[PDB]
Write a structure and sequence with these properties.
Chain A: InterPro entries: Calycin, Fatty_acid-bd, ILBP, Lipocln_cytosolic_FA-bd_dom. Chain A: It comes from Homo sapiens. Chain A: Monomer. Homodimer. The structure is a homodimer. By secondary structure, chain A is mainly beta. The first copy, chain A, has a single domain, classed as Lipocalin (Beta Barrel), CATH 2.40.128. Chain A is built from 2 helices and 9 strands; from the N terminus they run βααββββββββ. Chains A and B meet through β1, α1, β2, β3 and β7 of A and β1, α1, β2, β3 and β7 of B. Bound molecules: ligand T4B (2 copies).
């Protein structure tokens, strides 16, 4: 019969939201932060342990980086604000992404090495090495 | 070693030279620091000759931790320092914030298996609804 505070425990996904912007205006929150807050579709995570309550928030940001056909050059607009002429190929066991802009070039190689994705980014001298687990 | 082997979700486990590589590209300090802090999943798709590479990034903050019935100082995401109390009274979790001679109450309550969230300030009401993920 009775609602207890422990029943509120779990992961809650936002499905509907009405009056957010008005309410934020009443608190005196700025336009940019009102809009950004009203956009996000956060998970709410509630934990109650007897009398101790914690509320947390989870936002996942999903971006398509690029979408291409292998061996066909295409214009990429990069997160740092370059417009590159790019082409991805498959040569000698590695996915090679080649970027050209403003007389410059940068390569980004992706390969498997012991069940892990090794990403190697080169620009002039400089290598950035990133490693990922399959999940 | 074929291209299809790269398909799937990947989680960043190690990064080195990130800042130097970004510096070479002529990227600003803000984006460099940020980018280096981020721990994305990488999602790779390749049906034949077409390839898609997307990412996902999650955060992950604590809004507040407290003990029912005991007052505490909340620092809010908008920049209020409030005197706050949380109670479970009348079938609902009532969060009451006080600052600068003002007050707002946030009520969380289950209806029809959903979490109904009602934020009230003066007489202006935000209503948000959540579905349980399990
Ligand atoms: C930092 C911004 C970024 C992301 C990204 C996205 C979200 C969170 C974190 C970082 C990516 C990306 C693209 C595709 C797949 C996975 C990551 N590229 N850049 C990027 C965008 C313009 C320029 C340079 C770089 C970049 C710089 C250093 C190392 C990189 O290594 C990519 C990898 O690890 O494969 C990529
Ligand atoms: C920064 C905006 C925010 C979020 C939030 C965070 C991320 C994305 C979207 C919105 C939250 C929050 C807290 C707890 C759980 C889920 C969301 N509170 N504020 C917030 C922070 C200062 C002031 C007011 C409000 C706020 C405004 C409207 C509705 C709210 O109702 C919370 C709920 O729906 O339970 C809460």
């Amino acid at each position: 019969h009775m609602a207890t505070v422990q029943q509120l425990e779990g992961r809650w996904r936002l499905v509907d939201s009405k009056g957010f912007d008005e309410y934020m205006k009443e608190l005196g929150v700025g336009i940019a932060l009102r809009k950004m807050g009203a956009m996000a579709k956060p998970d709410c995570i509630i934990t109650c342990d007897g009398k101790n309550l914690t509320i947390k928030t989870e936002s996942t940001l999903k971006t398509t980086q690029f979408s291409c056909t292998l061996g066909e050059k295409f214009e990429e607009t990069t997160a740092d604000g370059r417009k590159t002429q790019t082409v991805c190929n498959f040569t000698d066991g590695a996915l090679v992404q080649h970027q050209e802009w403003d007389g410059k070039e940068s390569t980004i190689t992706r390969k498997l090495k012991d069940g892990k994705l090794v990403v190697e980014c080169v620009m002039n001298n400089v290598t950035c090495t990133r490693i990922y687990e399959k999940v």
